Amino acid sequence: MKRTWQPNRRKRAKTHGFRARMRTPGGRKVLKRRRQKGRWRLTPAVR
Amino acid sequence: AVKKFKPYTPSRRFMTVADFSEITKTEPEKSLVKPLKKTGGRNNQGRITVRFRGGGHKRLYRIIDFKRWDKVGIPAKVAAIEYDPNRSARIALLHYVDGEKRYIIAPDGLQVGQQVVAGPDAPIQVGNALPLRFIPVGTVVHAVELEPKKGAKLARAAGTSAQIQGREGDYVILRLPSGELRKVHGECYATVGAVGNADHKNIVLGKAGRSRWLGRRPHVRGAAMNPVDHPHGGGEGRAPRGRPPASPWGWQTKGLKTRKRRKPSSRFIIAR
RNA sequence: CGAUGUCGGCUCGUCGCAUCCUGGGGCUGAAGAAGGUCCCAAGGGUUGGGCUGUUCGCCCAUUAAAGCGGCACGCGAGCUG
RNA sequence: GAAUGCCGGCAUGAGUAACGAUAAAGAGGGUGAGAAUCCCUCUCGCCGUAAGCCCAAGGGUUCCUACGCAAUGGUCGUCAGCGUAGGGUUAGGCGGGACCUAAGGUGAAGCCGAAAGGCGUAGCCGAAGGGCAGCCGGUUAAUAUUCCGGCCCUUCCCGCAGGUGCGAUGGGGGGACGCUCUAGGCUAGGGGGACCGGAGCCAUGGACGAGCCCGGCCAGAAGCGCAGGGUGGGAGGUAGGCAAAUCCGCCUCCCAACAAGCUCUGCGUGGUGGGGAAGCCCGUACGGGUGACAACCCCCCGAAGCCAGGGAGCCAAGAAAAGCCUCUAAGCACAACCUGCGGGAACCCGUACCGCAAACCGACACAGGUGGGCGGGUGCAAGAGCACUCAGGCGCGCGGGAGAACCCUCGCCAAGGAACUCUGCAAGUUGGCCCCGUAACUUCGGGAGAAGGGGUGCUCCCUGGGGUGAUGAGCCCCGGGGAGCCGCAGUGAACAGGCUCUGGCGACUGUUUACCAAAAACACAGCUCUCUGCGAACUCGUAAGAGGAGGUAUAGGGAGCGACGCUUGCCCGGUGCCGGAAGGUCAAGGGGAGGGGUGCAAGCCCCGAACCGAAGCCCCGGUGAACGGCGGCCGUAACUAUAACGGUCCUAAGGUAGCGAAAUUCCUUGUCGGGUAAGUUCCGACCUGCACGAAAAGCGUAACGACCGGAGCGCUGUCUCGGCGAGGG
RNA sequence: GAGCUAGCCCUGGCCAGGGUGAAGCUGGGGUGAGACCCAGUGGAGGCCCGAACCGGUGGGGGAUGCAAACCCCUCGGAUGA
RNA sequence: UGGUUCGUGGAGCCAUGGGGGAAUCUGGGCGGACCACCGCCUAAGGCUAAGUACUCCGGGUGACCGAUAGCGCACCAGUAC
RNA sequence: GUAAAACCGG
RNA sequence: CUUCGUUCGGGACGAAG
RNA sequence: CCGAGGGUAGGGCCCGUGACUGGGGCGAAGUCGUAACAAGGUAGCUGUACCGGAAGGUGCGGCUGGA
RNA sequence: UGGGAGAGGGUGGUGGAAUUCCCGGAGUAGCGGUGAAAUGCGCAGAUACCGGGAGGAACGCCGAUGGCGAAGGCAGCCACCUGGUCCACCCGUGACGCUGAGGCGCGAAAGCGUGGGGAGCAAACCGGAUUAGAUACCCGGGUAGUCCACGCCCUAAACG
Ligand SMILES: [Mg+2]
Ligand SMILES: [Mg+2]
Ligand SMILES: [Mg+2]
Ligand SMILES: [Mg+2]
Ligand SMILES: [Mg+2]
Ligand SMILES: [Mg+2]
Ligand SMILES: [Mg+2]
Ligand SMILES: [Mg+2]
Ligand SMILES: [Mg+2]
Ligand SMILES: [Mg+2]
Ligand SMILES: [Mg+2]
Ligand SMILES: [Mg+2]
Ligand SMILES: [Mg+2]
Ligand SMILES: [Mg+2]
Ligand SMILES: [Mg+2]
Ligand SMILES: [Mg+2]
Ligand SMILES: [Mg+2]
Ligand SMILES: [Mg+2]
Ligand SMILES: [Mg+2]
Ligand SMILES: [Mg+2]
Ligand SMILES: [Mg+2]
Ligand SMILES: [Mg+2]
Ligand SMILES: [Mg+2]
Ligand SMILES: [Mg+2]
Ligand SMILES: [Mg+2]
Ligand SMILES: [Mg+2]
Ligand SMILES: [Mg+2]
Ligand SMILES: [Mg+2]
Ligand SMILES: [Mg+2]
Ligand SMILES: [Mg+2]
Ligand SMILES: [Mg+2]
Ligand SMILES: [Mg+2]
Ligand SMILES: [Mg+2]
Ligand SMILES: [Mg+2]
Ligand SMILES: [Mg+2]
Ligand SMILES: [Mg+2]
Ligand SMILES: [Mg+2]
Ligand SMILES: [Mg+2]
Ligand SMILES: [Mg+2]
Ligand SMILES: [Mg+2]
Ligand SMILES: [Mg+2]
Ligand SMILES: [Mg+2]
Ligand SMILES: [Mg+2]
Ligand SMILES: [Mg+2]
Ligand SMILES: [Mg+2]
Ligand SMILES: [Mg+2]
Ligand SMILES: [Mg+2]
Ligand SMILES: [Mg+2]
Ligand SMILES: [Mg+2]
Ligand SMILES: [Mg+2]
Ligand SMILES: [Mg+2]
Ligand SMILES: [Mg+2]
Ligand SMILES: [Mg+2]
Ligand SMILES: [Mg+2]
Ligand SMILES: [Mg+2]
Ligand SMILES: [Mg+2]
Ligand SMILES: [Mg+2]
Ligand SMILES: [Mg+2]
Ligand SMILES: [Mg+2]
Ligand SMILES: [Mg+2]
Ligand SMILES: [Mg+2]
Ligand SMILES: [Mg+2]
Ligand SMILES: [Mg+2]
Ligand SMILES: [Mg+2]
Ligand SMILES: [Mg+2]
Ligand SMILES: [Mg+2]
Ligand SMILES: [Mg+2]
Ligand SMILES: [Mg+2]
Ligand SMILES: [Mg+2]
Ligand SMILES: [Mg+2]
Ligand SMILES: [Mg+2]
Ligand SMILES: [Mg+2]
Ligand SMILES: [Mg+2]
Ligand SMILES: [Mg+2]
Ligand SMILES: [Mg+2]
Ligand SMILES: [Mg+2]
Ligand SMILES: [Mg+2]
Ligand SMILES: [Mg+2]
Ligand SMILES: [Mg+2]
Ligand SMILES: [Mg+2]
Ligand SMILES: [Mg+2]
Ligand SMILES: [Mg+2]
Ligand SMILES: [Mg+2]
Ligand SMILES: [Mg+2]
Ligand SMILES: [Mg+2]
Ligand SMILES: [Mg+2]
Ligand SMILES: [Mg+2]
Ligand SMILES: [Mg+2]
Ligand SMILES: [Mg+2]
Ligand SMILES: [Mg+2]
Ligand SMILES: [Mg+2]
Ligand SMILES: [Mg+2]
Ligand SMILES: [Mg+2]
Ligand SMILES: [Mg+2]
Ligand SMILES: [Mg+2]
Ligand SMILES: [Mg+2]
Ligand SMILES: [Mg+2]
Ligand SMILES: [Mg+2]
Ligand SMILES: [Mg+2]
Ligand SMILES: [Mg+2]
Ligand SMILES: [Mg+2]
Ligand SMILES: [Mg+2]
Ligand SMILES: [Mg+2]
Ligand SMILES: [Mg+2]
Ligand SMILES: [Mg+2]
Ligand SMILES: [Mg+2]
Ligand SMILES: [Mg+2]
Ligand SMILES: [Mg+2]
Ligand SMILES: [Mg+2]
Ligand SMILES: [Mg+2]
Ligand SMILES: [Mg+2]
Ligand SMILES: [Mg+2]
Ligand SMILES: [Mg+2]
Ligand SMILES: [Mg+2]
Ligand SMILES: [Mg+2]
Ligand SMILES: [Mg+2]
Ligand SMILES: [Mg+2]
Ligand SMILES: [Mg+2]
Ligand SMILES: [Mg+2]
Ligand SMILES: [Mg+2]
Ligand SMILES: [Mg+2]
Ligand SMILES: [Mg+2]
Ligand SMILES: [Mg+2]
Ligand SMILES: [Mg+2]
Ligand SMILES: [Mg+2]
Ligand SMILES: [Mg+2]
Ligand SMILES: [Mg+2]
Ligand SMILES: [Mg+2]
Ligand SMILES: [Mg+2]
Ligand SMILES: [Mg+2]
Ligand SMILES: [Mg+2]
Ligand SMILES: [Mg+2]
Ligand SMILES: [Mg+2]
Ligand SMILES: [Mg+2]
Ligand SMILES: [Mg+2]
Ligand SMILES: [Mg+2]
Ligand SMILES: [Mg+2]
Ligand SMILES: [Mg+2]
Ligand SMILES: [Mg+2]
Ligand SMILES: [Mg+2]
Ligand SMILES: [Mg+2]
Ligand SMILES: [Mg+2]
Ligand SMILES: [Mg+2]
Ligand SMILES: [Mg+2]
Ligand SMILES: [Mg+2]
Ligand SMILES: [Mg+2]
Ligand SMILES: [Mg+2]
Ligand SMILES: [Mg+2]
Ligand SMILES: [Mg+2]
Ligand SMILES: [Mg+2]
Ligand SMILES: [Mg+2]
Ligand SMILES: [Mg+2]
Ligand SMILES: [Mg+2]
Ligand SMILES: [Mg+2]
Ligand SMILES: [Mg+2]
Ligand SMILES: [Mg+2]
Ligand SMILES: [Mg+2]
Ligand SMILES: [Mg+2]
Ligand SMILES: [Mg+2]
Ligand SMILES: [Mg+2]
Ligand SMILES: [Mg+2]
Ligand SMILES: [Mg+2]
Ligand SMILES: [Mg+2]
Ligand SMILES: [Mg+2]
Ligand SMILES: [Mg+2]
Ligand SMILES: [Mg+2]
Ligand SMILES: [Mg+2]
Ligand SMILES: [Mg+2]
Ligand SMILES: [Mg+2]
Ligand SMILES: [Mg+2]
Ligand SMILES: [Mg+2]
Ligand SMILES: [Mg+2]
Ligand SMILES: [Mg+2]
Ligand SMILES: [Mg+2]
Ligand SMILES: [Mg+2]
Ligand SMILES: [Mg+2]
Ligand SMILES: [Mg+2]
Ligand SMILES: [Mg+2]
Ligand SMILES: [Mg+2]
Ligand SMILES: [Mg+2]
Ligand SMILES: [Mg+2]
Ligand SMILES: [Mg+2]
Ligand SMILES: [Mg+2]
Ligand SMILES: [Mg+2]
Ligand SMILES: [Mg+2]
Ligand SMILES: [Mg+2]
Ligand SMILES: [Mg+2]
Ligand SMILES: [Mg+2]
Ligand SMILES: [Mg+2]
Ligand SMILES: [Mg+2]
Ligand SMILES: [Mg+2]
Ligand SMILES: [Mg+2]
Ligand SMILES: [Mg+2]
Ligand SMILES: [Mg+2]
Ligand SMILES: [Mg+2]
Ligand SMILES: [Mg+2]
Ligand SMILES: [Mg+2]
Ligand SMILES: [Mg+2]
Ligand SMILES: [Mg+2]
Ligand SMILES: [Mg+2]
Ligand SMILES: [Mg+2]
Ligand SMILES: [Mg+2]
Ligand SMILES: [Mg+2]
Ligand SMILES: [Mg+2]
Ligand SMILES: [Mg+2]
Ligand SMILES: [Mg+2]
Ligand SMILES: [Mg+2]
Ligand SMILES: [Mg+2]
């Protein structure tokens, strides 16, 4: 049948991308933890 | 003069459509139309705030003259009578002798090719707009302003009419289509005659889908629900309602008034 | 109760006898025929349907007879549901 | 030494199940150390509205080539979508951006919120939408509407040449639109051909013949030709389009009523450019040459595509902004704008490859899922159905044998046909088209494909309509009649209803528990009650604000019933709601009688009674399509029986109409009647209604239903009662 | 977290092929004028049959599956909610 | 109403949202309801090191661990997945 | 302009 | 339930039980 | 070819019958009320609608077969 | 040709009396009702009185032994539209006439459907009296209906 992951590159960066974190105060605090964790990608990497 | 159908379906057996016989002109005036925001019942937070709405035919808004004191003394010719999808009534083209074109909401026994004019001067004949202090007592009238210079906000559905019952100082006393007796200021404009398309009452939609074409989604009874959702929900095999009958939000729906009691409007109001 | 799947039907049997029939016999209010009752006897057999989920039961048409019970009210790592 | 302990390693099942659609394989020759599995050839099978092409999304090097086989591949592998390396993606015209707006997001002004932040007009962002200028071939191992060839175009910028008052984000026009059905003329596409051009072939009994087989095109500027869309032309007056207009709108006389005329497309022809099969000969896995100076002609079918903003009907009444045209404003009128020509400039990103799938989404080379376009031919009435097959792509990445039980998927059967069983569950009967003929009932539409029948192939002859062609041959689509032939059988294969009678519930189409329930449940038009006069009620939110609604009592919200027919009886005692400026009760507050604590006292500080004190409650009324409720015991009629009648207790009132062993009935398989040989079911009745009953509606109702029950007809492996054969294990 | 799913807003697209033959018009019949009745044209409908598409009715297989919802036969809708 | 040990308690003190609303040394607060006496302070403006907390970092030390331990990571680890 | 009802007899 | 009273008689009504 | 007739399927009319049920008529002298005939004790009658154990009553309009 | 009478029919408008209800003033211990009472209404300020306002229905006097119409039926007034009928003149057509099976149209009241409206009356319903009992007569409330527009129903002591 039709499964959960139906990918869309416009969708992925307008939801999980860097400009969408830096609107919400809850999403700037996402990147602050991922600075502090050490993460090689802060954000889901889209072309 | 309401058209019925032969029963060549189940749903054509009861369906009536209107006669559309006063309609002269079948596509609207392009400078007087502008697009309609469909909403779904959804507000600026995007939450449903009126249930069971959405789905309709696409509509373009018709801009309606609801003042008529823009153009005191400037007469106009009734050019056409048109369908509006955005009200129960019909609308009328006025070609003013300026050459504005405006829509007025179309009264009953207005015919095409007709002088109308707004003013005090403004003789008492159907389509003409006056202050309520200058219309005679006892005449039927519509498009009534409530407070003056604010807009026609009374008696403008199809068939409806207010009737002038008295004067009292600056204020005049109106018999509303609700039956309310009501003190309205005499400087409020008002357009004479009843409205019509008065066979809008006698329309039978025939089927479920003609509700869906007007954007009326299915309406769920709270007896058919669960007690999370409704007071009336629950109960193994069709409860009779449990309780004094009630909204989804808890207030009672048989009899309970909610005119707010200290309204400042309540001393211009005489009846129901 | 860190699980022993429950009624009924189908399939598959097997066992007990306090025996439904067939076999042997005593008594009879056993003339004969057919019966009644009791004793010995399990070797074999103990039909097909209508109703109802039925077990059971009531009928229909036969029969020599249309037996009663046990095996987790036998049998769902065999089936149905 | 245990905690169904945590982590790691290795055993059991066990060389067991399985090796992923039953579309199918066989041989000869190569390479190789190693071939069922890699390459080539021949034969066979499968798809072919795809299992074949072209795009979008997604993926991201998988594309091509060279060298390889440790792991991946459900076996092998010399192969690969795998390992190493190299190469490969070329745009003014294709998509996107230096264009525009939609929902929505953002947001100067402004509003709101303890903070974080929430709104919000203009504006901005925002696209498979609107706008905008490239078609056909050829080359690469891998790119092309991108490179090349030919032929057309688009912007700017600078110059001359010729014209006019030029001139904006500002005004107007336009862009600009629904659903269904459709006429005219084309095109894509397809069929046929005695006509044209081709290597070749007479096979096996006949044929050297209008024989067989293959192919008879594409694009293409100006100009024409054929269809078709948009559109009136002048004159005055003008207060409207938030300044100004010669523009637009409005008013009033004249000229056509017309595409006559202007443009604007589409389609033919068009200077010219290109392509060109089958067979044969070869050297690759891919291709090349020849056939060729290739021919490139004529009829017919014909689009859902094109002219396109066509036409008609209908109600549910069908985006915006920019590009474009026109008009003026300041400013400018040595400027500027327009037309033609010449020269010059034309950026950024993508382009390989898979793309119904082994490269996307499902942990897998996973029988699942994924939007758009093309989708040939013949026959069956049609069709994108079904069967076969062009082009093209495949035999699904374990095989070889055997011929047991047993399972799956089939095929057939004597006699009986439901006796099987919870139930004809399952499977069989029926089945397309043409023509007869068709009941109760009905809301007059239906029921209807009722039911039940007859025909269906082929050959010969006569004959009636159309369409394209001149009214004609031909070619295409429809019929009628007569005569005859063959077979068990003529929709001879494939695709293609079993029917009828009768109840229950729900009017109906529809919706629902993704993943055990599709229903009598939900919804539904329609009925009623109730609220709401607009800054409405109601809803979301602290608020701002927003929906409602740019709606206005024929409207909006809430609740119940659920088309339709006939109807919806009594009780307001308690609860709810509605109406009452009397009265009782009631908090803060006002009020101070009087009393208290300290002072030597003026004073300071405390309690604190009458009385005035709102809503609400008590109280008084009304209201059932508001919450709800709607009896018991005795006696009595010319035989028992029964009780129309009467008496009596209680309640607020004591179930009316209509139905009733019911989807309601315990005793119950109630008692009769009908179907049956036999009927705990079913149908029709009686009423003794444990425990029906009127909008949690009552009783019926045509049509409808993958709902639930009963019965009969047809037909059958369901069964008596099994048997045999087939393929996948 | 609304890339699954539920609803709504904006913008596009899709639904082969057959039947049934509403209203309305045209001619005739009729009337004082009508209502009305015949044909013919017409092409309506939460109409009918049936592919794409959307579903999931009954049965069988599947059950360490091809699949953590599948496959075969069958069936419902298929111009509309 | 909050804070302080103070949960309405005899409830003061310090801040405050709402209402009323003074004075400038003979002025005002406090000493736990209140009053008298006796005393202590000078509100309605602001700034002010040090002594105090922490360890991203650098160093020293350890009756701290020794690759299932020690930080999740001794090894290109917030990585593969 | 009117005037409370007051049954029955094989 | 009973006796009386009104009535032509019964039923109703009236009075004593 | 037609064809007496036999068979299959579906309609129409008529007769007998049927659990149960509606009302009709006559009976033995039964039970309950008093509807109508006299102003029958509310004048009577009638069309219609509703209600009531039942005669009947009421509402609307009509009649003189009454004042 | 020329006049006349009439509640003859349809449409639009319009005048007053009265009932009920709302508001204001004033005013009290009762009002309605019956054969008598009672339900009911009323110190929460009724009936009766005055003034203002709303709404619906029927049109007093004229008015009868009257008129009109085919019948049912028709009654304030005004205007429009319109049928029928009578008289006078004897002018024209010139037997054109009478009746009428079917058909067609009209057809009181009640009743039905759709919407409107609803002051008074009032089936059904609720009480209070009467009675032996009252599903009646009497009284107090009261829903359809009565009114309008459209479409039905087709009846009667539709009788002279
Ligand atoms: Mg928004
Ligand atoms: Mg939001
Ligand atoms: Mg509903
Ligand atoms: Mg539920
Ligand atoms: Mg919830
Ligand atoms: Mg609740
Ligand atoms: Mg229940
Ligand atoms: Mg209950
Ligand atoms: Mg409840
Ligand atoms: Mg247990
Ligand atoms: Mg265990
Ligand atoms: Mg176990
Ligand atoms: Mg023994
Ligand atoms: Mg014996
Ligand atoms: Mg013996
Ligand atoms: Mg003997
Ligand atoms: Mg013996
Ligand atoms: Mg034995
Ligand atoms: Mg034995
Ligand atoms: Mg049977
Ligand atoms: Mg059975
Ligand atoms: Mg048992
Ligand atoms: Mg046994
Ligand atoms: Mg036991
Ligand atoms: Mg057992
Ligand atoms: Mg089992
Ligand atoms: Mg079992
Ligand atoms: Mg076991
Ligand atoms: Mg089952
Ligand atoms: Mg079960
Ligand atoms: Mg231990
Ligand atoms: Mg362990
Ligand atoms: Mg382990
Ligand atoms: Mg092993
Ligand atoms: Mg082996
Ligand atoms: Mg084993
Ligand atoms: Mg084995
Ligand atoms: Mg195996
Ligand atoms: Mg495989
Ligand atoms: Mg070799
Ligand atoms: Mg094939
Ligand atoms: Mg891509
Ligand atoms: Mg991948
Ligand atoms: Mg790679
Ligand atoms: Mg190689
Ligand atoms: Mg390998
Ligand atoms: Mg391998
Ligand atoms: Mg090799
Ligand atoms: Mg490759
Ligand atoms: Mg490679
Ligand atoms: Mg630029
Ligand atoms: Mg831009
Ligand atoms: Mg923009
Ligand atoms: Mg801020
Ligand atoms: Mg915002
Ligand atoms: Mg905005
Ligand atoms: Mg586009
Ligand atoms: Mg382009
Ligand atoms: Mg390629
Ligand atoms: Mg090309
Ligand atoms: Mg080029
Ligand atoms: Mg200009
Ligand atoms: Mg513009
Ligand atoms: Mg415009
Ligand atoms: Mg072509
Ligand atoms: Mg062609
Ligand atoms: Mg040739
Ligand atoms: Mg030969
Ligand atoms: Mg050809
Ligand atoms: Mg003009
Ligand atoms: Mg101007
Ligand atoms: Mg023309
Ligand atoms: Mg050409
Ligand atoms: Mg040309
Ligand atoms: Mg060639
Ligand atoms: Mg058109
Ligand atoms: Mg526009
Ligand atoms: Mg713009
Ligand atoms: Mg311009
Ligand atoms: Mg740049
Ligand atoms: Mg490319
Ligand atoms: Mg490509
Ligand atoms: Mg595709
Ligand atoms: Mg796949
Ligand atoms: Mg995959
Ligand atoms: Mg993969
Ligand atoms: Mg999976
Ligand atoms: Mg993943
Ligand atoms: Mg694999
Ligand atoms: Mg594979
Ligand atoms: Mg698909
Ligand atoms: Mg085709
Ligand atoms: Mg085809
Ligand atoms: Mg064909
Ligand atoms: Mg054929
Ligand atoms: Mg066909
Ligand atoms: Mg096609
Ligand atoms: Mg096919
Ligand atoms: Mg091939
Ligand atoms: Mg057989
Ligand atoms: Mg046979
Ligand atoms: Mg048979
Ligand atoms: Mg049976
Ligand atoms: Mg049996
Ligand atoms: Mg059955
Ligand atoms: Mg079946
Ligand atoms: Mg067959
Ligand atoms: Mg039928
Ligand atoms: Mg028919
Ligand atoms: Mg048939
Ligand atoms: Mg043949
Ligand atoms: Mg022709
Ligand atoms: Mg043609
Ligand atoms: Mg034959
Ligand atoms: Mg078939
Ligand atoms: Mg049935
Ligand atoms: Mg039943
Ligand atoms: Mg249904
Ligand atoms: Mg489910
Ligand atoms: Mg699930
Ligand atoms: Mg279903
Ligand atoms: Mg299901
Ligand atoms: Mg209804
Ligand atoms: Mg709120
Ligand atoms: Mg709005
Ligand atoms: Mg608003
Ligand atoms: Mg409403
Ligand atoms: Mg509503
Ligand atoms: Mg319901
Ligand atoms: Mg009721
Ligand atoms: Mg009550
Ligand atoms: Mg009450
Ligand atoms: Mg009460
Ligand atoms: Mg109240
Ligand atoms: Mg106080
Ligand atoms: Mg106090
Ligand atoms: Mg005080
Ligand atoms: Mg109070
Ligand atoms: Mg007796
Ligand atoms: Mg009684
Ligand atoms: Mg009753
Ligand atoms: Mg029964
Ligand atoms: Mg029986
Ligand atoms: Mg029987
Ligand atoms: Mg029954
Ligand atoms: Mg019964
Ligand atoms: Mg019951
Ligand atoms: Mg019930
Ligand atoms: Mg009940
Ligand atoms: Mg009810
Ligand atoms: Mg119901
Ligand atoms: Mg029923
Ligand atoms: Mg029903
Ligand atoms: Mg009916
Ligand atoms: Mg029915
Ligand atoms: Mg169904
Ligand atoms: Mg359905
Ligand atoms: Mg078998
Ligand atoms: Mg076998
Ligand atoms: Mg075999
Ligand atoms: Mg086999
Ligand atoms: Mg979604
Ligand atoms: Mg069609
Ligand atoms: Mg017709
Ligand atoms: Mg059609
Ligand atoms: Mg349909
Ligand atoms: Mg259907
Ligand atoms: Mg398609
Ligand atoms: Mg799908
Ligand atoms: Mg579903
Ligand atoms: Mg299924
Ligand atoms: Mg299954
Ligand atoms: Mg079907
Ligand atoms: Mg269908
Ligand atoms: Mg505290
Ligand atoms: Mg405190
Ligand atoms: Mg304290
Ligand atoms: Mg405490
Ligand atoms: Mg304060
Ligand atoms: Mg303060
Ligand atoms: Mg001083
Ligand atoms: Mg203090
Ligand atoms: Mg102190
Ligand atoms: Mg103190
Ligand atoms: Mg102290
Ligand atoms: Mg101090
Ligand atoms: Mg200071
Ligand atoms: Mg500190
Ligand atoms: Mg350190
Ligand atoms: Mg170690
Ligand atoms: Mg470690
Ligand atoms: Mg009496
Ligand atoms: Mg009979
Ligand atoms: Mg008697
Ligand atoms: Mg009498
Ligand atoms: Mg009488
Ligand atoms: Mg009488
Ligand atoms: Mg009565
Ligand atoms: Mg009368
Ligand atoms: Mg004469
Ligand atoms: Mg009548
Ligand atoms: Mg009437
Ligand atoms: Mg009526
Ligand atoms: Mg209605
Ligand atoms: Mg009254
Ligand atoms: Mg008594
Ligand atoms: Mg009365
Ligand atoms: Mg008379």
Residue numbers in the entry:
A (entry chain R7): 1 to 47
B (entry chain RD): 2 to 273
What does the paper say about this structure?
The m1G37 modification also prevents the ribosome from shifting out of the three-nucleotide mRNA codon frame (‘frameshifting’) to ensure the correct polypeptide is expressed. The absence of m1G37 in tRNAPro causes high levels of +1 frameshifting on so-called ‘slippery’ or polynucleotide mRNA sequences where four nucleotides encode for a single proline codon. To address this question, here we solved six 70S structures of tRNAPro-CGG in the presence or absence of the m1G37 modification and bound to either cognate or slippery codons in the P site. We further show that ribosomes bound to mRNA-tRNA pairs that result in +1 frameshifts promoted by tRNAPro-CGG result in large conformational changes of the 30S head domain, consequently biasing the tRNA-mRNA pair toward the E site.
To address whether tRNAPro-CGG induces a +1 frameshift by a similar mechanism as tRNASufA6, we determined two X-ray structures of ASLPro decoding either a cognate CCG or a near-cognate, slippery CCC-U codon bound at the P site. We used chemically synthesized ASLPro (17 nucleotides) to ensure G37 is fully methylated at the N1 position. The structure of P-site ASLPro interacting with a cognate CCG proline codon was solved to a resolution of 3.1 Å and reveals that the three nucleotides of the anticodon (nucleotides G36-G35-C34) form three Watson–Crick base-pairs with the C+1-C+2-G+3 mRNA codon, respectively (mRNA nucleotides are numbered starting at +1 from the P-site codon). In the structures of ASLPro interacting with the mRNA in the 0 frame, there is well-resolved density for G1338 and A1339, while there is some disordering of these nucleotides in the context of ASLPro bound to the near-cognate, slippery codon in the +1 frame.
